[PDB]
């Protein structure tokens, strides 16, 4: 399973 994020990715 891919790791969970630390924090949300930014929008594009």
């Amino acid at each position, epitope marked *: 399973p891919p*790791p*969970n*994020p630390n*924090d949300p990715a930014p929008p594009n």
Partner: antibody
Amino acid sequence: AYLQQSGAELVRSGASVKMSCKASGYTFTSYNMHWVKQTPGQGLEWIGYIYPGNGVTNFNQKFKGKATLTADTSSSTAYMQISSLTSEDSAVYFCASAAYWGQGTLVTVSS
Amino acid sequence: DVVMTQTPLTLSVTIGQPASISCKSSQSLLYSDGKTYLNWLLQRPGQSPKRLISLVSELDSGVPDRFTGSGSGTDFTLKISRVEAEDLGVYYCWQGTHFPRTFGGGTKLEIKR
């Protein structure tokens, strides 16, 4: 998986330094790539991130215009450049993304 | 900035003892996607940090189930059911919901023997 940082640096006051963070074992473009300062004996301070999927950066206001963050998706390598170095910039610098941290790059500012 | 307050500053524990570390944020860590971005790290001297927990309670691969993370809003806890010798080091929480990202001051776990 892992993050491999470049080696230690001796740099003069007022010069700049560029360090690297090579990623493997997770999708480099799917997670924010963070840079974090630790003065030894002290805690962790966030510098900024780049999201390699689209190049967007976000910075701690303390480091805006001092730190430049880039990411080479062809080589899965992130870079941090710090300009106008002073004594307060001697520290270990980490990169961190997803479940991983790099091993740190020690920068010593000295003439 | 959102301040992360960690207590205690130091945990002095024997092998087998339960341990608990508190992390309180000055503002709610609930993000607009419904997730709470609270991470726990462990750092050993001359070594880098290692992530143990993300999204408040989700253990990373390979982390022993003696570790549990709990909380919501502003109040978070990392617990160790029974301390082992390899658990020593400095634990940090850090929040991913607000800018700038911020870290707790660390809790040093030391072993008595």
